[PDB]
Amino acid sequence: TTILAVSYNGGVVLAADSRTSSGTYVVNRASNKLTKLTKKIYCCRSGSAADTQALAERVSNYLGSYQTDIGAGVNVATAANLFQKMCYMNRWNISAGIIVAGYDPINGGSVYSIPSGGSCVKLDYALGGSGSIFLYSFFDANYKPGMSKSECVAFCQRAVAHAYSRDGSSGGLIRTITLDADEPEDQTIPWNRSPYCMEKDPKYVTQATQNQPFSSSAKITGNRMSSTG
Amino acid sequence: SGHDQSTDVFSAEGRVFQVEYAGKAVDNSSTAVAACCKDGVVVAVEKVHTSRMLEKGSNNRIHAVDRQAGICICGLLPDGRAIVSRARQEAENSRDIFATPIRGSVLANRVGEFMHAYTTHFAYRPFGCSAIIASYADDGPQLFVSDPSGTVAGYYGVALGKAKTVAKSELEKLDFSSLTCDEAVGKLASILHEVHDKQKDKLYEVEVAWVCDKSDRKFVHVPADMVPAE
C-alpha cells in the first residue's frame, strides 16, 4: 500500500494504489483505499484491511450524524479528531495508518496524517503505507510546493508509480481524486498507461552480464544466449 | 657409489645425478617439436607404436589442460600424466577462486614447482618427462618447456627427444615472425618425417595440436586431413 495526499491552493489531491495482498498473494488487484467520509472529506487507508474499514465507516456515521444536527458543513479538523480518538484507544489491537485530507470553506485544503501510533499531524503533504519509504527522497528532490490542480494530479500519479515499481506490497491501478470547491473529480489510470514502469525504463534494457560464456580471456562480453555460441 | 642413489645427495661438485639420470629418460624418448607462430602455437609429436593392432588415438601424448592451454609431454607417458593431472588442478584453481583464465607464464611456473618438489626429498624420484606448455592466454601465445630439474623457459621453438639436435637445426630455417599456424602444421610434421628413421621402428605416426585465433583461442587437435601424408 502506497498512499499520499498533497495540498495545492484550492484543495487537496488524494492518491493511492489498488492492491490488498495476503502476505505474498494478490487477493485483490482493484482495491479502493480512498474512503468517503463526507462529500468533501476523504481518507486514505493503509494497514489492516478490516481494522481500517471498521474505523472508516464508524467515523463516517458519527460525522454524518453531526452534519445533520449542526445544519452546516463539517470541518476537516473535526473528522481528523475522530480518527485520532479511535486510533489511540485501540492502538494495541488494530493496525491503522490513516491520511485524512479534505476541503472546508473555512480553512481551505487540509491534510492530516495519523500514523499507527495514533498521533495527529497537520501537513502540507503526507505519506503513508509500506511503500511510502521510497517517496521521502523522491519528494525531497522533485517536489516544489505551490503547484496547480492539473500539476498535482500528474505529480501524484507519477509519485505513486515510482513507489509501486520498487515495492512488492503495492501495485495495480492508481486511484486519485481531488477535493476542492468544485465537484470531487476522480481518476483511475491503469498499469499499462502508468507514467512510470521499470520494464520500459530504457536503462534496465541491458541484462546484467551474469552468465558468461566459457572463454580464454577475462574480457567480459555479455551473457550466453545460445548453446552453440 | 652411494652418491647417486637418491635426490637429496649433492655430488662432490654440486650435481644431483638422479635428476640428471632422469634427463636421460627424455633423451631416449620419441621426438617432440613446437613452434610459436605470432597468433598461436603449434605442437607436434611422433607416436612410436609397438604393435600393428593399436587403435588410432591410443597413447596420445597431447592433453588439454585448460580451454586455452594444453601440455604435451616428452619422456615417460605415465610420469607425465601426473604432471598433466596436476596442471589441470592448477588451472581449475584460477577459474574457481580467481575467476580468470590462467596465464601462460603462470601455468608453466606451477609445473616447474611441482616437478622441482620431487627432486629435493629422499622418498621421491624426479620425473622422466619434459612437459611442453602451449598456451594462448591474455599475455599472447606462449611456449614453455619444463625439464625434470624443474627449470622452465620460454621458447620460440623447441626440439625434444632422441633426435633433438637434428630437428633443432631444422627449426632454425623457419621464421617465427612471419610464420603462421596455417603453414606450420605442414612444416613441423615434415620435420618429424625427415628427422626420424624407419630402420628401427616400423610403426610411427605423428600427432599435431595447436591453439590459435582460427580455432577461437581453443586448444584442439587437428582435423585428420590437414597433416601431410609422409
Ligand SMILES: *[B]([O])([O])[C]([C][C]([C])[C])[N]C(=O)[C]([C]C1=[C][C]=[C][C]=[C]1)[N]C(=O)C1=[C]N=[C][C]=N1
Ligand atoms: B496495503 O497493502 O497496506 C493494504 C491496505 C488496506 C487498508 C487496503 N493492506 C493489505 O494489503 C493487507 C495486508 C497488509 C500488507 C502490508 C501491511 C499491512 C497489511 N491485506 C489484508 O489485510 C487482507 C489479507 N487477506 C485478506 C483480506 N485482507
